[PDB]
Amino acid sequence: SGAIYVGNYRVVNRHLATHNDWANLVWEDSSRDLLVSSTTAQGCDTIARCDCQTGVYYCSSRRKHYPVSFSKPSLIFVEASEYYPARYQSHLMLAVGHSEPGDCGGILRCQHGVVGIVSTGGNGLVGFADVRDLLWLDE
Numbered sequence: 598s599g600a601i602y603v604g605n606y607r608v609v610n611r612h613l614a615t616h617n618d619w620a621n622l623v624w625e626d627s628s629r630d631l632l633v634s635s636t637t638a639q640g641c642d643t644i645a646r647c648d649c650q651t652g653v654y655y656c657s658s659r660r661k662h663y664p665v666s667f668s669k670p671s672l673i674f675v676e677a678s679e680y681y682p683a684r685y686q687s688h689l690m691l692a693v694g695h696s697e698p699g700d701c702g703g704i705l706r707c708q709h710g711v712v713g714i715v716s717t718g719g720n721g722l723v724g725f726a727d728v729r730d731l732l733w734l735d736e
């Protein structure tokens with residue numbers, strides 16, 4: 598679990614979005630595993646606008662933050678689940694680090710702010726859905 602609260606927006610993993618999120622839908626993309634819903638209260642997370650390949654993510658299965666090097670956002674193949682058939686997930690960045698299902702939603706940050714959220718993992722790897730290209734979140 599976990600979300601990004603920026604202005605009048607809430608960003609979550611699409612596979613974990615609630616009935617409230619769907620009844621206040623702004624945008625969603627299955628290929629990215631993202632869903633953005635509207636909020637009445639003002640969010641104070643800052644989104645980074647950079648090309649950083651290093652940062653820190655929160656890992657709930659260890660109650661710890663870890664520093665990581667991560668790849669540039671790309672199309673990476675992801676195996677079937679109760680949420681999605683076998684497919685390429687776009688805007689995904691991989692890093693060598695611990696993750697378990699339950700860690701999805703953990704924020705990844707660099708010195709410029711919020712980079713993205715945990716969305717995939719396994720085999721000593723962790724995948725993050727990038728949010729830095731969604732320029733409309735600030736405006």
Ligand SMILES: CSc1ccccc1CC(=O)N1CCC(F)(F)[C@H](C(N)=O)C1
Binds near residue numbers: 696698699716
């Ligand atoms: C941190 S997720 C993780 C970690 C270790 C091992 C396994 C997982 C689970 C995982 O990779 N999934 C299941 C959930 C999901 F939303 F459908 C993901 C996706 N974005 O398609 C794929």
Ligand SMILES: [Zn+2]
Binds near residue numbers: 707708
């Ligand atoms: Zn950065």
